Each structure stands twice: as C-alpha cells, then as structure tokens.
C-alpha cells in the first residue's frame, strides 16, 4: 500500500480551524462526563487507537482510512469505552460533512491536548476514507499486563524508538482506567484533565504496591489513591526508559517538545504527503481567539 494524502476539496486553514473551534466548544460544554474529568482524555485515547493499528511492514492500518467507523474495528475488545468519544464527535461530523473520518478522529486528539493546556501539536490534513475491507483485523493494539521488553518490541512495529515511547506514555497522566472497559481501575495522579509531567513524577515519587484488583488483574497501587499499569511500571524497571522518565520529571518543557513531535509522528504514520500539500497547520486555542 501507498496512501497518498488528498486535501478535502477546496478547504483551507480557516475551515479546519472551525472544526477545531467546534470540538473545543463542546469540550467546554460537556464538562460533566466521567465524574467531571470531561471528554479530553477519551478523545486523545481515540486518536492513538485509530493510529496504533499501523504496521510498517505492509503499510496496513494507521489513521488514514478512518476504518474505526466499521463494525470490526469499532467492536474490537481493545477499543471498549471509545464509543463515548465517537458519540461526542458525531454531531460535529454532521455540522462539517466534508471532513474525512481519519482527519476528524485525529484532530479530536490534537484539540483535546491543546485545550488541556498541552503543547501545540502541528496537524496535517489529507486522510481519505477507505472501504470496509481495508479495516485491520483485531489484535494489533498492545496488552497492559506485560513488561518493558514487550513495550519496546511493540512500538518498533510503529517505528517509535525509546524516547518517543516514553514521551507518548506521558499521556497516561490524563483520565483513568475503568474496570468495565479494560479490567483495570483507577486514576494515575491528581491533575487528570490538565496536561503536565505528572505521570513521571508519580512514577518516581510514589510508594507503589503490587495488588490484584476486582477483575483479577495486577496493578501497581499507591497510598495516595493512584494506579499504574504493569506496562507503565515497566518504564522504571528498564534502565534506558528510566533515564528518560527522570529527564521529563525534571523538565516539563522538554517533555512537551518531545510529546509534540512524537504524537504528530504517530498520527501521520503510513501516509505519504506530496510536496504540493499544505505545510502542517498550528491551530489557535479558544483562549487565543477570545472565544
């Protein structure tokens, strides 16, 4: 496969900035979801799960085809709970029927991070919806019950190296795990709907205790009321990953700069951009626009 980026016919920066402004205004408004966490966390988890099916060996999966819209990917056990992020974005797709599904699912993630006080993420338009038979089979998304060796081997299929993997995993400060979705339960820190380096600081400063939860799965619990997954806890058990965790814990700006670069790379894997294509757009936040 080659997947060439094609701009939605006739659309420019200001059209996309209107879809972003509409996702951000609805984030402001539906602030009660999941005990007042808001939809920001499930929207960046939707943007990474539609991108994480990519396989570098044959160019299949990835964000291009917007295939989550199909039953097979939608009903994938690893995608339980993302139906909430889909339902949120659906009125917005009726308001802007011209934007592709992959472009909308991925911009939902960019909007959520920037509106949660994260770094600016450059975003590129051009994904094209593809047929139901291009939909990737289930089982390409990662297990939580595993170690640092599995994590490194997994992220190599998306050719993400160590620093990219540690920066990307910093998004687990956001939101929480839910027992009925994944068999895990609990938050990862205090500020779980503001984007900060808190995941790293909690992983270095809490007194973590291994326990089984109500689903019979193990997780790392702390006195404070926080939890970490086995794969999260892996980042301080591996010596290469641990020097990077310490770097981000001492420097949130370096974390922002590296998360920005890696999240964009994750959203654009498997897509060729012609050089006639527009440069990546930097969207303004509501606040920047006075809205």
Ligand X SMILES: Cc1csc(C)[n+]1C
The two three-digit tokens of residue 98, written as one number: 């011209």
Which one of residues 232, 238, 258, 268 is an interface residue with ligand X (CB under 6 A)?
232
CB 184 within 8 A of CB 194: no
Instruction: Please identify which residue in 177, 181, 196, 197 interacts with ligand X, judged by CB under 6 A.
Output: 177
262 within 8 A of 167, measured Cβ to Cβ = yes
Q: Which residues bind ligand HEM (CB under 6 A)?
A: 41-42, 44-45, 48, 81, 142, 144, 151, 168-169, 171-172, 174-178, 181-182, 184, 231
Interface region with ligand X, contact rule CB under 6 A, candidates 16-24, 127-135, 228-236, 252-260: 228-236
Beta bridge mates, 210: 220
Query: Per CB under 6 A, which region of 63-71, 89-97, 169-177, 235-243 contacts ligand X?
Result: 169-177
- Give the number of C-alpha atoms closer than 13 A to the C-alpha of residue 274, restricted to the C-beta side: 9
Using CB positions, name the residue nearest to ligand X. Answer: 188
Does residue 229 touch ligand X according to CB under 6 A? yes
52 binds ligand X (CB under 6 A): no
**197-235: burial string, b at 16+ Cβ within 10 Å, e else:** bbbbbbbeebebeeeebeeebbbbbbeeebbbbbbbbbb
- Rounded to 5 degrees, φ, ψ at 193 are -145, 25
What does 228 interact with, of ligand X, ligand HEM, none (CB < 5 to 8 A by kind)? ligand X
* Contacting residues toward ligand X, per CB under 6 A: 172, 175-177, 187-188, 228-229, 232
């Amino acid at each position: 496969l080659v997947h060439v980026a094609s701009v939605e016919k006739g659309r420019s920066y200001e059209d996309f900035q209107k879809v972003y402004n509409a996702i951000a205004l609805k984030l402001r408004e539906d602030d009660e979801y999941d005990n007042y966490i808001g939809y920001g966390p499930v929207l960046v988890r939707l943007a990474w799960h539609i991108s994480g099916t990519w396989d570098k060996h044959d160019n299949t999966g990835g964000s291009y085809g917007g295939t989550y819209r199909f039953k097979k990917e939608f009903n994938d056990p690893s995608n339980a709970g993302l139906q909430n992020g889909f339902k949120f974005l659906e009125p917005i797709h009726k308001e802007f029927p011209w934007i592709s599904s992959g472009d909308l699912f991925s911009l939902g993630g960019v909007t959520a991070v920037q509106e949660m006080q994260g770094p600016k993420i450059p975003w590129r338009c051009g994904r094209v919806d593809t047929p139901e038979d291009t939909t990737p089979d289930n089982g390409r998304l990662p297990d939580a019950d595993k170690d640092a060796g599995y994590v490194r081997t997994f992220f190599q299929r998306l050719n993400m190296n160590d620093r990219e993997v540690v920066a990307l995993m910093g998004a687990h400060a956001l939101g929480k795990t839910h027992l009925k979705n994944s068999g895990y339960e609990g938050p990862g820190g205090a500020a779980n709907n503001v984007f900060t380096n808190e995941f790293y600081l909690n992983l270095l400063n809490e007194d973590w205790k291994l326990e089984k939860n109500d689903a019979n799965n193990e997780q790392w619990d702390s006195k404070s009321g926080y939890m970490m997954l086995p794969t999260d806890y892996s980042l301080i058990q591996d010596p290469k990953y641990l020097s990077i965790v310490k770097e981000y814990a001492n420097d949130q700006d370096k974390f922002f700069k590296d998360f920005s670069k890696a999240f964009e790379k994750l959203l654009e894997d498997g897509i060729t951009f012609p050089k006639d294509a527009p440069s990546p757009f930097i969207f303004k936040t509501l606040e920047e626009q006075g809205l």
